[PDB]
Design a protein around this ligand. Structure first.
Ligand SMILES: CCCCCCCCCCCCCCCCCC(=O)OC[C@H](COP(=O)([O-])OCC(O)COP(=O)([O-])OC[C@@H](COC(=O)CCCCCCCCCCCCCCCCC)OC(=O)CCCCCCCCCCCCCCCCC)OC(=O)CCCCCCCCCCCCCCCCC
Ligand SMILES: CCCCCCCCCCCCCCCCC[C@@H](O)O[C@H](CO[C@H](O)CCCCCCCCCCCCCCC)COP(=O)(O)OCC[N+](C)(C)C
Ligand SMILES: CCCCCCCC/C=C/CCCCCCCC(=O)OC[C@H](COP(=O)(O)OCCN)OC(=O)CCCCCCC/C=C/CCCCCCCC
Ligand SMILES: CCCCCCCC/C=C\CCCCCCCC(=O)OC[C@H](COP(=O)(O)OCCN)OC(=O)CCCCCCC/C=C\CCCCCCCC
Ligand SMILES: CCCCCCCCCCCC(=O)SCCNC(=O)CCNC(=O)[C@H](O)C(C)(C)COP(=O)(O)O
Lengths: 84, 459, 175, 63, 55, 88, 70, 219, 104, 124, 178, 128
């Protein structure tokens, strides 16, 4: 059992520089009179699920909210139990 | 002791009256049976010795050597069975006769209650080895190698006979028991110095000492596989046995006298281990490794402490077995490649996996991996040298490291990497060769369970 | 156990404390050791009993060899080989016995060091002094003989030491 | 079923040999197995003798 | 008798059994790694007992 | 690994994909056998940039000697198939 | 022993809900453990015993005479 | 000599680590720096605490290599961090495991690393030692934090940089179970072991407030 | 042999040699498993001096730190029974000098 | 730490060397000079066989801590009070050591002031 | 690797190789894609400035001077593809590459399995025996007198002919045999 | 300008930084052509001996034979006693021996003196 599903490639017109830092690269390059011939080749790195990034502090705080909620529930239960 | 000697003598008429295609089968079976018979001698006492008669005695220094000498013959026959295939029956019978005579001479040499009998047999072992080297040898330099091997030995040993007859004229007996009980100090005199030199140099040349080690690479490279086996396994240990036997008379002169030899061996082990790193030949590399090990044995004997003697005995046995195995492996490679150079045939682990496993085990046991008896002797000698002087360890340390290096180097050049594209005549390893390696290696790992059986009389 | 003598290898009474459960929680150690007993110790014990009754059905004994005392090297003529042989054998046997004595003392020392644990430096001074004394004695007799040691060499060493001691005593008295 | 036989032929059988070999051969010889002489604390009692270690010097207890 | 020694030697001993069986038929099948993994896990859970006794 | 057994169709599809995202070439004019020097008017530097894109796309880098004499997508596909031992 | 997941070729790979929920649960449990230990045992980081000031101790307790007795 | 050797080793290895591109090389240099810290602990006559460090480091560094090997296998045997970009969402379980491992290595309060490494820092600071060795240990802690965040940033945060054919997969019970066992270990082992073992050394129960927080502020 | 071209089709790809070509006298010292002469981005002298400088600096500063250690504003640790005399070495039949520790 | 800067950069004789402390007689400050107290004796504290470096004046709290650690085993968090007590006893020992250091420092200061005053009066 | 080498490298080959090395090392320096694209285009533009230069001495002055600059900023730890001569998996699978002639040494009990494979192998052996005998003559007649000048082999020119010296190029083990 | 790279023995000059390559001449081109011609002739001979079906043996390499023979058997017949050879041989074969003899002799003399005066503390030394 291997991956034989006949995968088909997407359409090459989908990849556009717009909305990516390569657009800024194009602006900076045309400010000097130059143009990148491979701009659309690397657009897929900014198109799909890779478009939304996370910060370092957000990366460290992966499960802070759920843990905090569990913590407050547990401390409330302990405070209501020991006070008896 | 005749229960071992007479069957060895009967091996000759049995071989010469054998059917033309049954010599190897008959010889191997009866050699193994004689080896089994030799096992009885191992049960030694903490008392004096096993004095069978006026002519022969046994000792726990002599018993392991006798057992190894008996065990070596079936292995030599199995190794020689291959390259003697296109040979006439008469010459194969002559080869087997020479091997049997060598075993008989060694057996009588190791018991030898008297020193002149010991010398006679010690030099009688020389003729069969010379004939084997110079007759069934491949290259044209076998004649020069035989000349070197003969003349180094005789130049070393001719003063020994004069020293022995002089010692008997003065003392009155050459018997080992009488000599040990009646030993008297030797005054520090010029005549006594030369007597010490004459008594020691004959056994020093056969170890061999670093200064006098030239004959050995020639003899090992040019001899057939059986010749290389018998030279590396037993013939080198004759010098150590002779030194351990003759050193008793030498004291207290040995302390002053020992320094030139101690320095030569401690530097020559480093020199030869370093030579092993840059070698283009398997046989020469194994020969130089043997030289390094026997230099360490020389150091152990010269220090002359109980731990030194036990370490020397254990190291001699372990080196004999390991070097015989290494030469057998190199010969198995040579019989396929016909070049006998490491860099030509490469990546043999991919083609011959079990033979690569045998190579790994042999290189590990040459590397002195614990708890093998190789490292037992290594460590006993190192501790004795440290007690002798706390600086020796540094040299010893270097030696160990260098040893490991070239061992794994020999394991990496020939077994690992990419196989040479052109060689296509590498056939699967035969059952005979695998049995040879197994019979070489199993006794070592059995002996490491009972080290006291090879630790000598000072245990 | 009766297999070995208690006086040769002394042991303290081995006082052990009592279990004092301060809580009602069932500890796992007791239940674990009980199930270990039930699953391991009983079958081993019954196998041992079967082997012991099998051994008792056949019984034989072996006797420790005893040796007479023979004149030593000091009661031997300068060239009389028979008495020198007997004395050398006796001296070698005595050397083996002394080696075993030192082994026994070292075993005592190691056992003390392990048994008293953290206070081994104080509670094993007796064994340390015992080993120091026996080591001093053993070293004097055989330390420098080396390989090819013999009774004559040991006697010569003892004579050299005792002339040194006699000279030292005479000089101290005549100081 | 797979874990039933394995826990017998790989755990139960090996411990039978070792426990038999330890309890009956190794401990037959002296000083082969040496324990720690476990700690004795004040207030404890010893099963073999039955005596009790006296308590301590009643230090002033505060905070 | 004082299962500390028996258990602490049994762990190391049972750690060696797959090396013994390396010449058996199981070594030529695809179940050998799982065999070794199960042996290691059982050795760990068996060595947990002397740790509890020490604690 | 768990790597699907890529075929000639997949190789050629990915080659033409990379070439069509090359904006210096209008996609509707290129073809499988279309030359690089003459049929598309591309510089040699443009060809070596194409080699860059191929190496970054297939995860392996082509030696310079072989790379500098590759002028068609078809022969590039053939070379890469020979390197990867592609059956169909 | 897994499920069949095909390659994607330049889009975000398929994500199983099981791995996401397991990772989120483990991160949340780790953070909850940190916060629980912080509430229950806070002195392990902040300390429980104050550090004394050597200059605040008066000369009487330290054994000091006014520079003339000794 | 042991203290100085440990200090120089941990400094040099962390300094080499903070600038490597191979993830395996970075983590191996982290291991070497931890060994240097262990010999620093030995040199100040605290062997039991060094043993505790060995036991905790085993857990979290082994799990760190599990995460690294998972990444390498998922990126078709790619080890350079220059060819790995966004993996925080593309592969979440390895992400959280590597985050927890990096936090434990750095020494987060109440984490497995904290029980050992915090006591290491306190004992080195509260001892009659070399000033240079203490300074080098503190700089080594700084560089440990440095290469930890370097690994996280260059493997987990940026835009993807791997070849277009995406073969990223984790849905395999073996990898997940093996990683999560060491995750539970690297979360709770320090706490349970420290509170279960008997006490074996005199504590630094009193300490200046700024000198108690030196490890955290350096990290 | 390491800096030989790794893309040429040698007859011995691992050793990077051709069949009939002459062999260097020190080939076995240059076998890609041993010393190599491939140029580095930094010059040999710079690495030596830089490496030597770093090692020397470390040795000197460790010596200085030995000369100038670090400690705490505290006195030596005090032990109850004659500085633990009986259980550090023993010798009870000597009755050493008693020590009384200062109460403050 | 601040004493290191004061010593290695300032006056060497101004502050003590921790190796040779104390350098003055104990009762030099006041003649009361109470002696320190023991709760644990030789025999029981040997029976506990704690460790040689743990054999300090805080031994009793440590012995009770081990008593709790042995008795309430599965509840490894049962006795926390004795852990606090032993921490407090070590805290008191360290505070007393700090006070001893400060005391010897101020005796050194006053002594140095004394010979400098004596030098001033002698030169006058 | 497949093509035969040339007696030398021309100026344009050298400039192309320098461009390749510099662009790879700049990609190694510029981890992120946008930064790499911007700097690579800046480098390409700088490179194209001297494109129409005709002076050969000036041409020699160009690139060689650049090579010194490249050597100064060559990123001592560049990115290398895993299977490249510097990669971390350069020769991982060379230990699995077993020669074909080894199959000639198999025991008949082993050859009982896989009979169709060995039949096809026998057909291959027959084809090789005929084709080599043809190829010897073909190469003898086509080779220039005095020995070959370039190690490139000619193709087959007849109908039944096969490429000369083809057996050990066609029968490579595999890239990943196991 | 940029800092210059200085070659050494163990770090040779880079291929692209050799001043010799940029100095191109027809003689140099002819030399490279004949070098590649020799290389291609050797390659052709090896492949002719390699591809043949009939051959079932190791191909003998005269270069390897020459290398081994020169390394092993051609040394002494080409030896000439020279001041360089004499001094290097004497040093490397005598100096270490006397150095180690001096070191060990001094160590053993010190130990023997210490044991004569007896201030050596050889307690528990029973194995030698
Ligand atoms: C460890 C406990 C073992 C208990 C079980 C009993 C095991 C008995 C094994 C006896 C040795 C094997 C016979 C020697 C030659 C090999 C035979 C053979 O043809 O194998 C083919 C067979 C099938 O091969 P295949 O798949 O057809 O061929 C594949 C290819 O050839 C490719 O082959 P490969 O790559 O698979 O190679 C085989 C494999 C293994 O093959 C070998 O290399 C064999 C030699 C290994 C040792 C080398 C010498 C070093 C000195 C050690 C001396 C120990 C002596 C102890 C007494 C020995 C009595 C005989 O390679 C290795 O594993 C290398 C191991 C290196 C070990 C390093 C550490 C050594 C010291 C360890 C401690 C020993 C004492 C402990 C005492 C304290 C605790 C009790 O493979 C095996 O049988 C492998 C055996 C398992 C490995 C054993 C390694 C340890 C053995 C140590 C000696 C015995 C210790 C007993 C007490 C243990 C406690
Ligand atoms: C070539 C590879 C190695 C081969 C084997 C080499 C090992 C054999 C070398 C022999 C070792 C030394 C031989 C004699 C040593 C005696 C001790 C001497 O060296 O020390 C001084 C001796 O002084 C001088 O050495 C005098 C001798 C000088 C003449 C010897 C030649 C020196 C170099 C020759 C080396 C050539 C050896 C090989 C010959 C073929 C002590 O002064 P002294 O107290 O008065 O004599 C004490 C001895 N008494 C008591 C018997 C009188
Ligand atoms: C390389 C080996 C080491 C060589 C070291 C020295 C080499 C230089 C010597 C060359 C040969 C010299 C021949 C003459 C030596 C004379 C020695 C001698 O006569 O002593 C005999 C001595 C006492 O003589 P008496 O007159 O009977 O006593 C009465 C008064 N006390 O008696 C004996 O011990 C006899 C023993 C024979 C001495 C051996 C002579 C040969 C040299 C010793 C061997 C060393 C060389 C070995 C060669 C090594 C080649 C492998
Ligand atoms: C003293 C020891 C002297 C060193 C012995 C040298 C032996 C020479 C023969 C070795 C064979 C040659 C060899 O191994 O090749 C070198 C080989 C290959 O180089 P790579 O870096 O791996 O490159 C691979 C990428 N292409 O690498 C090596 O193993 C060389 C190792 C040499 C180390 C020698 C230097 C050791 C110095 C240590 C001093 C410090 C001691 C520590 C003090 C501690 C005190 C508490
Ligand atoms: C990060 C590391 C730093 C590296 C530093 C690199 C330095 C870069 C600057 C070098 C400056 C130059 O251009 S080097 C100047 C070398 N001389 C010439 O370029 C003259 C003629 N040019 C050619 O012939 C070419 O091939 C060409 C026409 C371009 C295409 O050819 P195709 O039509 O056959 O593709």
């Amino acid at each position: 059992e291997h991956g034989h599903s006949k995968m088909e490639l997407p359409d090459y017109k989908q990849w556009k520089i717009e909305g990516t830092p390569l657009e800024t690269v194009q602006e900076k390059l045309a400010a000097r009179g130059l143009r990148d011939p491979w701009g659309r080749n690397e657009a897929w790195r900014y198109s799909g699920g890779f478009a939304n990034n996370v910060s370092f502090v957000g990366a460290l705080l992966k499960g802070f909210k759920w843990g905090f909620a569990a913590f407050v529930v547990a401390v409330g239960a302990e405070y209501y139990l020991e006070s008896q | 002791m005749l229960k071992i000697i007479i069957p060895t003598t009967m091996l000759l008429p049995m071989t010469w009256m054998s059917k033309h295609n049954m010599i190897w089968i008959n010889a191997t079976v009866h050699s193994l049976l004689i080896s089994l018979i030799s096992l009885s001698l191992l049960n030694q006492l903490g008392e004096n010795s096993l004095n069978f008669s006026l002519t022969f005695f046994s000792d726990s220094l002599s018993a392991p050597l006798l057992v190894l000498t008996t065990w070596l013959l079936p292995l030599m026959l199995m190794a020689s069975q291959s390259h003697l295939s296109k040979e006439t029956t008469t010459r194969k019978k002559l080869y087997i006769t020479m091997l049997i005579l060598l075993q008989l001479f060694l057996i009588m040499t190791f018991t030898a209650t008297e020193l002149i009998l010991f010398y006679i047999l010690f030099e009688a072992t020389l003729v069969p080895t010379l004939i084997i080297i110079t007759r069934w040898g491949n290259q044209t330099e076998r004649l020069n190698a035989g000349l070197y091997f003969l003349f180094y030995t005789l130049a070393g040993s001719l003063p020994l006979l004069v020293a022995l007859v002089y010692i008997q004229n003065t003392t009155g007996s050459l018997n080992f028991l009488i000599i040990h009980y009646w030993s008297h100090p030797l005054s520090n005199s010029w005549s006594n110095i030369f007597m010490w030199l004459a008594c020691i140099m004959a056994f020093m040349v056969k170890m061999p000492l670093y200064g006098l080690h030239l004959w050995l690479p020639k003899a090992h490279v040019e001899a057939p596989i059986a010749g290389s086996m018998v030279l590396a396994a037993v013939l080198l240990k004759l010098g150590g046995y002779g030194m351990m036997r003759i050193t008793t008379i030498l004291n207290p002169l040995t302390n002053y006298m020992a320094y030139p030899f101690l320095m030569l061996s401690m530097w020559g082990m480093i020199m030869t281990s370093s030579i092993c790193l840059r070698q283009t030949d398997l046989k020469s590399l194994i020969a130089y490794s043997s030289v390094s090990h026997m230099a360490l044995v020389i150091v152990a004997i010269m220090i002359q402490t109980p731990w030194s003697f036990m370490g020397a005995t254990a190291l001699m046995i372990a080196h004999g077995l390991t070097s015989s195995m290494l030469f057998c492996l190199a010969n198995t490679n040579y019989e396929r490649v016909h070049s006998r150079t490491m860099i030509l045939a490469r990546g043999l682990q991919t083609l011959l996996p079990l033979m690569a496993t045998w190579w790994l085990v042999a290189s590990l046991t040459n590397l002195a991996l614990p708890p093998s008896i190789n490292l037992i002797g290594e460590l006993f000698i190192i501790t004795a040298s440290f007690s002798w002087s706390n600086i020796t360890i540094i040299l010893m340390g270097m030696n160990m490291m260098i040893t490991a290096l070239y061992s794994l180097y020999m394991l990496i050049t020939t077994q690992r990497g990419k196989y040479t594209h052109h060689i296509n005549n590498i056939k699967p390893s035969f059952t005979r060769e695998n049995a040879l390696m197994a019979l070489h290696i199993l006794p070592l790992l059995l002996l490491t369970l009972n080290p006291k059986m090879i630790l000598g009389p000072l245990y | 156990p009766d297999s070995w003598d208690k006086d040769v290898y002394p042991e303290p009474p081995r006082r052990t404390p009592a279990p004092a459960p301060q809580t009602s929680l069932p500890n796992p150690v007791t239940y674990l050791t009980k199930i270990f007993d039930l699953l391991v110790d009983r079958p081993v014990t019954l196998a041992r009993e079967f082997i012991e009754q099998q051994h008792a059905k056949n019984r034989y004994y072996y006797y420790h060899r005893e040796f007479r005392r023979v004149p030593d090297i000091t009661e031997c003529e300068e060239k009389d080989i028979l008495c020198m042989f007997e004395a050398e054998m006796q001296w070698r046997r005595d050397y083996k016995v002394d080696q075993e004595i030192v082994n026994i003392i070292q075993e005592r020392l190691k056992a003390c060091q392990q048994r008293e644990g953290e206070s081994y430096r104080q509670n094993c001074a007796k064994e340390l002094e015992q080993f120091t004394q026996v080591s001093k004695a053993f070293q004097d007799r055989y330390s420098d003989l080396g390989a090819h040691y013999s009774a004559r060499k040991c006697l010569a060493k003892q004579k050299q030491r005792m002339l040194a001691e006699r000279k030292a005593a005479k000089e101290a008295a005549a100081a | 079923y797979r874990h039933s036989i394995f826990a017998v032929t790989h755990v139960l059988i090996p411990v039978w040999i070792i426990h038999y070999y330890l309890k009956y051969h190794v401990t037959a010889k002296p000083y082969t197995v040496v324990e720690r002489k476990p700690r004795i604390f004040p207030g404890d009692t010893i099963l073999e003798t039955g005596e009790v270690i006296p308590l301590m010097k009643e230090f002033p207890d505060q905070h | 008798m004082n299962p500390f020694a028996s258990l602490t030697l049994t762990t190391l001993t049972i750690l060696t059994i797959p090396i013994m069986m390396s010449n058996s038929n199981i070594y030529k099948t695809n179940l050998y790694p799982n065999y070794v993994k199960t042996t290691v896990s059982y050795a760990f859970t068996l060595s947990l007992v002397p740790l509890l006794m020490f604690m | 690994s768990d790597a699907p057994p890529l075929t000639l169709e997949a190789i050629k599809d990915r080659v033409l994909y990379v070439l069509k995202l090359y904006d210096k070439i209008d996609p509707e004019k290129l073809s499988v056998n279309s030359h690089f020097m003459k049929d598309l008017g591309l510089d040699s530097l443009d060809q070596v940039e194409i080699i860059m894109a191929m190496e970054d796309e297939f995860g392996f880098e082509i030696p310079d000697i072989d790379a500098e004499k590759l002028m068609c997508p078809q022969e590039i596909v053939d070379y890469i198939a020979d390197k990867k031992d592609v059956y169909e | 022993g897994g499920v069949h997941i095909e390659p994607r070729y330049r889009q975000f790979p398929q994500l199983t809900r099981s791995q996401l929920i397991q990772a989120e649960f483990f991160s949340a449990t780790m953070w909850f453990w940190i916060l629980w230990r912080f509430w229950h045992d806070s002195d392990a980081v902040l300390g429980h015993f104050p550090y004394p000031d050597p200059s605040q101790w008066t000369d009487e307790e330290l054994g000091i005479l006014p520079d003339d007795e000794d | 000599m042991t203290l100085c050797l440990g200090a120089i080793t941990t400094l040099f290895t962390a300094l080499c680590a903070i600038t490597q591109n191979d993830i395996k090389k970075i983590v191996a240099f982290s291991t070497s720096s931890q060994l240097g810290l262990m010999m620093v602990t030995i040199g100040i006559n605290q062997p039991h605490l060094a043993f505790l460090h060995i036991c905790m480091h085993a857990f979290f560094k082994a799990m760190l290599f599990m995460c690294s090997g998972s990444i390498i296998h998922s990126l078709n045997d790619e080890q350079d961090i220059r060819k790995m970009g966004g993996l925080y969402k593309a592969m979440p379980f390895t992400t959280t495991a590597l985050i927890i491992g990096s936090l434990a290595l750095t020494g987060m309060p109440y984490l497995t690393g904290f029980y050992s490494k915090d006591l290491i820092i306190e004992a080195v600071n509260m001892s009659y030692t070399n000033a240079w060795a203490l300074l080098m240990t503190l700089i080594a802690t700084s560089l440990t934090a440095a290469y930890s965040t370097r690994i996280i940033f260059f493997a987990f945060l940026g835009k993807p940089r791997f070849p277009p054919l995406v073969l990223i997969n984790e849905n395999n019970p073996l990898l997940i179970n093996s990683i999560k066992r060491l995750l539970i270990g690297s979360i709770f082992a320090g706490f349970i072991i420290s509170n279960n073992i008997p006490p074996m050394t005199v504590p630094n129960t009193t300490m200046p407030l700024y000198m108690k927080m030196t490890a955290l502020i350096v990290t | 042999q390491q800096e030989r071209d790794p893309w040429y089709d040698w007859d011995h790809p691992d050793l990077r040699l051709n069949w009939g070509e002459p062999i260097h006298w020190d080939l076995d010292m240059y076998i890609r498993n041993r010393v190599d002469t491939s140029p580095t981005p930094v010059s040999w002298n710079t690495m030596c001096k830089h490496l030597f400088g770093f090692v020397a600096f470390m040795l000197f500063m460790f010596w200085v730190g030995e000369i100038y250690p670090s400690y705490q504003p505290v006195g030596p640790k005090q032990y109850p029974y004659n500085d633990l005399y009986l259980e550090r070495g023993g010798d009870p039949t000597k009755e050493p000098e008693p020590v009384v520790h200062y109460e403050i | 730490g601040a004493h290191l800067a004061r010593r290695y950069l300032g006056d060497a004789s101004k502050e003590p060397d921790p190796l040779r402390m104390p350098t003055f007689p104990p009762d030099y400050g006041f003649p009361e000079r109470k002696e320190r107290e023991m709760v644990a004796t030789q025999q029981e504290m040997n029976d506990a066989q704690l460790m040689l470096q743990q054999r300090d004046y805080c031994a009793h709290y440590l012995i009770q801590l081990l008593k709790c650690k042995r008795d309430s085993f599965p509840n490894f968090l049962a006795c926390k009070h004795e852990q606090h007590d032993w921490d407090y006893c070590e805290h008191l020992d360290y505070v007393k050591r700090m006070k001893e250091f400060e005391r010897e420092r101020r005796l050194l200061q006053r002594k140095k002031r004394r010979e400098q005053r004596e030098a001033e009066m002698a030169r006058g | 690797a497949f093509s035969a080498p040339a007696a030398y490298l021309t100026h344009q080959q050298k400039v192309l190789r320098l461009y390749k090395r510099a662009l790879r090392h700049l990609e190694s320096w510029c981890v992120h894609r946008d930064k790499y694209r911007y700097f690579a285009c800046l480098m390409r533009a700088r490179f194209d400035e001297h494109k129409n230069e005709k002076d050969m001495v000036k041409a020699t002055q160009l690139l060689r001077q650049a090579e010194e600059e490249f050597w100064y900023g060559q990123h001592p730890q560049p990115y290398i593809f895993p299977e490249s001569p510097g990669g971390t998996s350069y020769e991982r699978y060379e230990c699995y590459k077993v020669p074909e002639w080894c199959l000639d040494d198999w025991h008949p009990s082993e050859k009982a399995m896989y009979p169709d494979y060995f039949a096809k192998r026998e057909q291959w052996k027959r084809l090789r025996r005929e084709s080599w005998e043809r190829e010897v003559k073909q190469l003898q007649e086509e080779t220039p007198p005095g020995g070959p000048r370039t190690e490139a082999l000619p193709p087959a020119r007849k109908e039944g002919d096969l490429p000369p010296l083809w057996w050990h190029i066609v029968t490579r083990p595999r890239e990943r045999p196991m | 300008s940029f800092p210059k790279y200085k070659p050494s023995r163990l770090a040779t000059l880079p291929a692209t930084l050799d001043p010799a390559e940029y100095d191109i001449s027809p003689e140099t081109r002819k030399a490279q052509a004949e070098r590649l011609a020799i290389r291609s002739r050797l390659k052709r001979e090896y492949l002719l001996q390699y591809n043949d079906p009939n051959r079932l043996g190791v191909i003998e390499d005269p270069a390897l034979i020459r290398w081994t023979y020169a390394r092993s058997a051609n040394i002494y017949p080409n030896f000439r006693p020279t001041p360089k050879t004499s001094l290097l041989g004497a040093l490397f074969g005598i100096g270490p021996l006397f150095f180690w003899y001096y070191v060990f002799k001094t160590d053993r003399d010190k130990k023997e003196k210490l044991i004569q005066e007896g201030k050596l503390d050889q307690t528990f030394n029973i194995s030698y």
